[PDB]
Design a protein around this ligand. Structure first.
Ligand SMILES: CNS(=O)(=O)c1cccc(Nc2cc(Nc3ccc(C(F)(F)F)cc3)ncn2)c1
Length: 263
């Protein structure tokens, strides 16, 4: 908390009294719609707690990309006041569009979303010190009214680091490896499938059952023949159990922009 005050540039320093809280939008603590320095803003307020908050702010205050949620400031005074402030995106979450409002989108709109998400993630992964989002899902892809998207919520994000295996169980071999930026590409891939089908992955199963089936029984969602080839390719590679075999986001971007040229 003291080291963070020094490193975090002083213009990101906010006092709780400068934030006006209006409505709850998500409910770890709570996220409010509100107002701060004449901006409409979303505010994440909190309930190891400190370290977590400190990581998050350090991650956020580095970010500047039009497909990544824009950081406004945080409150540091004390742990009772800990809060993060970002821009507010009026068009909502991708999850809401697809599954609550059940809005039907055409292929161009879908790909635009997929590309902007991929562009935000390419940015995160190619910083001098790369960042893993680690919680990428349709709840954290938010939408401008014009249809473009940004990646939000770095609550689980981390900076990337820089026995005898022949008899090890698969889960133990995987516990020992340590995850990379590629964990994000797998998440992305489910997100991309979610966008095209309009369905929550394994909707009929609970989160933990879905995770189990994907990790142990090796199941992935059904890829219908109606899914275009370049895309099902990204899907198939993107959710490979072997992380090393998932594409880099720069490529994901390259293929989807290529699809927009034919949409
Ligand atoms: C503090 N920023 S963050 O990136 O850490 C973060 C973490 C968790 C959730 C958010 N949510 C949002 C939501 C948002 N827009 C929004 C528009 C409409 C609705 C409506 F449909 F319910 F009304 C709801 C929301 N803009 C920004 N962050 C952010």
């Amino acid at each position: 908390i003291l080291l963070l005050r020094a490193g975090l540039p002083s213009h990101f320093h906010l006092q709780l009294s400068e934030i006006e809280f209006h409505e709850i939008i998500g409910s770890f603590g709570k996220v409010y719609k509100g107002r701060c320095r004449n901006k409409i803003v979303a505010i994440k307020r909190y309930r190891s707690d400190v370290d977590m908050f400190c990581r998050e702010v350090s991650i956020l205050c580095q970010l500047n990309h039009p497909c990544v949620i824009q950081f406004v400031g945080a409150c540091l005074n004390d742990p009772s006041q800990f809060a993060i402030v970002t821009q507010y995106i009026s068009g909502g979450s991708l999850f809401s569009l697809l599954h609550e409002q059940k809005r039907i989108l055409d292929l161009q709109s879908k790909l635009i979303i997929a590309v902007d998400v991929a562009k935000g993630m390419e940015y995160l992964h190619n910083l001098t010190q790369p960042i893993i989002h680690r919680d990428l899902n349709s709840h954290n892809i938010l939408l401008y009214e014009d249809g473009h998207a940004v990646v939000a919520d770095f609550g689980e994000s981390r900076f990337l680091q820089s026995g005898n295996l022949r008899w090890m169980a698969p889960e133990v071999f995987t516990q020992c490896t340590r995850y990379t930026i590629k964990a994000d590409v797998f998440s992305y891939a489910l997100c991309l499938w979610e966008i095209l089908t309009g369905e929550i992955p394994f909707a009929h199963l609970k989160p933990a059952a879905a995770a189990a089936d994907m990790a142990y029984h090796h199941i992935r969602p059904p890829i219908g023949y109606s899914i275009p080839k370049p895309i099902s390719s990204l899907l198939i590679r993107g959710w490979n159990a072997c992380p090393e075999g998932r594409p880099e986001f720069s490529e994901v971007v390259m293929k989807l922009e290529e699809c927009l040229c034919n949409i």
